[PDB]
Amino acid sequence: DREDLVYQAKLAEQAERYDEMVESMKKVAGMDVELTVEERNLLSVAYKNVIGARRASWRIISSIEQKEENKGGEDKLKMIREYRQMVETELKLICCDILDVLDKHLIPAANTGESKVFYYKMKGDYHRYLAEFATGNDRKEAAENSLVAYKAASDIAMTELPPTHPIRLGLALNFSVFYYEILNSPDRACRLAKAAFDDAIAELDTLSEESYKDSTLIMQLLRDNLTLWT
């Protein structure tokens, strides 16, 4: 059954039917056992494709909305805003879905440093995606929940993973984006990203055969952000 679900998740991924990949991997998560690296990754890809489709839609519609505000077409504005809201409803439902799977199933069953950091960082990512479109109280609560999860992931990562580890780097990259895009803090975003990058450069001997390409790519992204932000 667990192997069958993995197989079905992999078929859905090949067919680019990410909804189905999510349903298959959600059933694996629901077994209340430690996921393998492969399963963790399948689950995370599934949801990142599902949410990423709506985030890309959201950003297109919001830009359209911004163009129309500049020309004051209010009939158009009406429909664009109603359409945005609908996509926001979907983003909320999807984030709420994985955040429940994380809280119910994933985080309670996680018993390795690596998996705990991966799931807390995921929790940080999904609150952060809530925060991207949230205003008012919702934005504050999403930002606080994201911050808490990313600090929790950081606490474990600092003690349990080498600074070159791809999940630790991935956490640094996304938490720096969080400080930049949600907390509006370019200075803290830059420090976190720069620290993560310097700490890995200091310990390049910790680079693993399994993930040196993954580490190198994240370190290049940390650098691309720092470029973008300074």
């Binding site: 990142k48 494709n49 984006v177 895009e181 992204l221 691309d224 973008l228």
Partner: peptide, 7 residues
């Protein structure tokens, strides 16, 4: 527009 971890 910042880069986050790819997938």
């Amino acid at each position: 527009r910042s880069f986050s971890e790819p997938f």
